[PDB]
Design a binder for this molecule. Sequence first.
Ligand code: HEM
Length: 153
Amino acid sequence: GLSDGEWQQVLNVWGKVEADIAGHGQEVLIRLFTGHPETLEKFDKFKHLKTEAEMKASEDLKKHGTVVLTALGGILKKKGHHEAELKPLAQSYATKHKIPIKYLEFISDAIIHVLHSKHPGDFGADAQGAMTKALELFRNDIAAKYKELGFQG
Ligand code: HEM
């Protein structure tokens, strides 16, 4: 768990995202897809995109970036009491989509990257530690549900 102080940092940093949800959302999705092309194959919707220029020009990709980050902001505001929120995603990814926990590791890292890229010098050592921990808690609670459901890999 995180202390109240670490949660305060997480929600302060999130304010940065809330000022431009689509821009951050889009950058996150591009960093995942170019760094790990295998991830793109889980989206029938975007598998056509080949070049980063195409990704950048896709309005639909921006839309999907908004949907993802809005869902994450909701979960983070619960300060760890997010069991109702996580259930649909975990059940969905463990049975229908078959999303390895590794992909969640990948997008967590992509979020950290984007925050440093868009706010250089404004995302401190303490803020990075608190944001890293919050994304780990999210991943670990999903990992618990994956074990229950036998989503092995
Ligand atoms: C920060 C973590 C993530 C959050 C909060 C999140 C959230 C969401 C939301 C809110 C939806 C829309 C639900 C719906 O269509 O009913 C969605 C759909 C989806 N997400 Fe996740 N997601 C995340 C990570 C990922 C990752 C890493 C992948 C990688 C393969 C992924 C793959 C998908 C797919 C394939 C869909 C369905 C899209 C479609 O059928 O059009 N998600 N996600």
